Ligand SMILES: Cc1cn([C@H]2C[C@H](OP(=O)(O)O)[C@@H](COP(=O)(O)O)O2)c(=O)[nH]c1=O
């Protein structure tokens with residue numbers, strides 16, 4: 079996989095963010111995770127966590143996996159990095175997302191993410207509390 083440049087346009091919620099990629103506005107959905115909706119428990123905390131990570135970053139990057147790059151809603155599917163730290167992984171590690179929606183061929187970082195979920199669950203963090 080390859081990291082590509084993007085700039086933040088706007089935080090949306092725990093697992094979606096609007097970025098400019100190749101010069102075009104796009105909503106990205108984070109691969110292989112699921113945050114609670116804003117209206118649900120830990121939804122507000124997940125939203126705030128992602129927002130802080132992407133707004134504070136000097137460099138946002140997008141990393142597509144080997145499979146589909148857009149979902150059926152037109153959202154980009156990627157792993158998102160803030161100053162070199164993967165947002166997807168950071169959310170899982172903090173118990174603010176679950177590993178989820180792991181489709182064959184967009185699953186490169188599955189086992190990294192599952193390792194983070196295990197440590198979050200061992201710590202009883204947030205969703206796992
Ligand atoms: C993360 C991800 C979601 N999706 C689709 C599956 C779900 O379809 P449904 O809308 O039919 O449930 C939806 C879950 O995203 P959200 O958790 O943002 O709602 O997006 C993909 O198709 N590929 C993906 O990689």
Ligand SMILES: [Ca+2]
Pocket residue numbers: 093112113114115
């Ligand atoms: Ca969600």
